Amino acid sequence: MMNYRKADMKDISLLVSIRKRQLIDEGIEPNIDIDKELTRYFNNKLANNLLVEWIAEENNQIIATAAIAFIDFPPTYTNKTGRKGYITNMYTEPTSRGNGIATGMLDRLVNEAKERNIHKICLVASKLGRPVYKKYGFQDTDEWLELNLLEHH
Amino acid sequence: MMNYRKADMKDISLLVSIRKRQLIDEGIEPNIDIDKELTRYFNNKLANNLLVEWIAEENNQIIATAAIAFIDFPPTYTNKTGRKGYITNMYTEPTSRGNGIATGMLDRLVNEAKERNIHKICLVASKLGRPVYKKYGFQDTDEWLELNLLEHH
Ligand SMILES: CC(=O)SCCNC(=O)CCNC(=O)[C@H](O)C(C)(C)COP(=O)(O)OP(=O)(O)OC[C@H]1O[C@@H](n2cnc3c(N)ncnc32)[C@H](O)[C@@H]1OP(=O)(O)O
Ligand SMILES: CC(=O)SCCNC(=O)CCNC(=O)[C@H](O)C(C)(C)COP(=O)(O)OP(=O)(O)OC[C@H]1O[C@@H](n2cnc3c(N)ncnc32)[C@H](O)[C@@H]1OP(=O)(O)O
């Protein structure tokens, strides 16, 4: 049956592959090689515990992943530490979708946040992710805006 | 006339006061004391150069502030390093508004980003900030969602 564990340094090449697989599944054009940058990101953030990535395994093949990154923003009255958990790297094997795996992963990620005294979580919703997060209680945020420096000047 | 400089450690108590002033101007309820957390945030992020806060001064009173924080997200094909500049702490003295001060500050912050090989900037728009950022080229982002752990469980 399914087993859940937190990824270790030893798991990095798998996390890297699964992240690429996830992004391509989301429709992104894999135009350039980002292996070096992905591997460095996982190495650094896992080593410093600024990233926690849960995995679901069966027959020691990864069925699903889900991560939370801890990010620092300026304190405000509604979030005195300024810290937030940033949810990312969520992927469930297609034949395993619709069984509540990602939803149960969200529970585990929320727990990582609470254990670190974090009570605000955020994420960027993909097409498939969106109804899952909406169902879970994530809220629309018309306030977030982004500037691409290659596009505007 | 106006002088612009980057804030130093010595400026922290001013940055702290101006941030509170800014948030209250935005309509937030200053319900709890966050001086300790604000001071620690500035101390840490300035010391490590993960925050750059520009100030505009006249007669050595601060007229405006504007900051950019450098935050790490997982690499993707459209942002290979995963890094982003997060714009924050923008405030212009009310009698000085509408003169293009915040807009010129945005130019300086974009420059901080480029000098660090960052080409994606993001922010959370306040009521007064929004038309400024829209005019500047920031784009709506329906993908960002947030969960408040005190509200949903
Ligand atoms: C923040 C980010 O990480 S964004 C990127 C997200 N990942 C991707 O887009 C990669 C490609 N897509 C995927 O890997 C997947 O579709 C994921 C990860 C988004 C979702 O994984 P899943 O394990 O299929 O999620 P989960 O099973 O919890 O929910 C999906 C659906 O099954 C249903 N479901 C799950 N559990 C139950 C249940 N107990 N009773 C009834 N329906 C259920 C959901 O309600 C939902 O269907 P709906 O849209 O009609 O409401
Ligand atoms: C990401 C964050 O930091 S969000 C928080 C932002 N800060 C706050 O909300 C705190 C309270 N509000 C403020 O301090 C201010 O209103 C700020 C910081 C948002 C804006 O500061 P300002 O210096 O007034 O911005 P700026 O002068 O560049 O632009 C504001 C307006 O003056 C006008 N303006 C500026 N320069 C010109 C110009 N050269 N020609 C014509 N109009 C101009 C703008 O077009 C705009 O008016 P509009 O809404 O009709 O388009």
Give B152's DSSP letter.
Answer: -
Give the ranges where A1-153 is alpha helix by DSSP (H): 12-25, 35-47, 101-114, 129-136
Nearest CA to B34 among A78, A7, A138? A78
Handedness of CA B127, B131, B133, B137 (dihedral sign): positive
Range of the domain at A107: 3-153
Q: Tell me how far apart the alpha carbons of residues A39 and A35 are, in angstroms, rounded to a whole number.
A: 6
Hey, how many other C-beta atoms are within 10 angstroms of the C-beta on B111? 13
Residues whose CB is less than 8 angstroms from the CB of residue A94 and which lie 6 or more positions away in sequence, other chains included? A25
Q: Which ligand is nearest to the CA of B97?
A: 2
Torsions phi, psi of A145, nearest 5? -130, 150
Resolution (Å) of this entry: 1.9
Distance CA B6, CA B12 (A): 12
Of B101, B82, B80, residue with least CA distance to B92: B101
Total number of residues shown for chain A: 153
Question: What stretches of chain B show up as alpha helix (H) in DSSP?
Answer: 12-25, 35-47, 101-114, 129-136
B120 closest CA partner among A117, A128, A150, A52: A150
Q: With CA atoms as reference, report the closest residue to B89 among B61, B68, B73, B62.
A: B68
Give the residue from chain A lying closest to B31, CA to CA.
A77
Q: Is the CB of A131 under 6 A from ligand 1?
A: yes
The SS3 of residue A61 is strand
Question: Does A97 contact ligand 1 (Cβ within 6 A)?
Answer: yes
Please give the radius of gyration of chain B, using alpha carbons only, rounded to the nearest integer: 16
- Concatenated DSSP letters of A115-135: TTT--EEEEE--TTHHHHHHH
A105 Cβ inside 6 Å of ligand 1: no
Taking CA–CA distances from B20, the nearest residue in chain A reads: A76
Residues of A in contact with B70 (CB under 8 A): none
DSSP state of B128: T
**Residue B62's beta-bridge partner residues?**
B57
Looking up tokens 């190495």 gives A43
A4 with A54: CB under 8 angstroms?
yes
Give the number of C-alpha atoms closer than 13 A to the C-alpha of residue A51, restricted to the C-beta side. 23
**Helix axis angle, B35-47 relative to B12-25, nearest 10°?**
120
Per-position DSSP letters for A70-88, written without gaps between them: EEE---BTTBTT-EEEEEE
**Cβ pair A144:B147 closer than 8 A:** no
Can you tell me the distance from the alpha carbon of B115 to that of A65, in angstroms, rounded to the nearest whole number?
Answer: 35
Query: What CATH number is given to the structural domain containing A46?
Result: 3.40.630.30
A65 to chain B nearest CA, in Å?
A: 14
Number of domains observed in the structure of chain A: 1
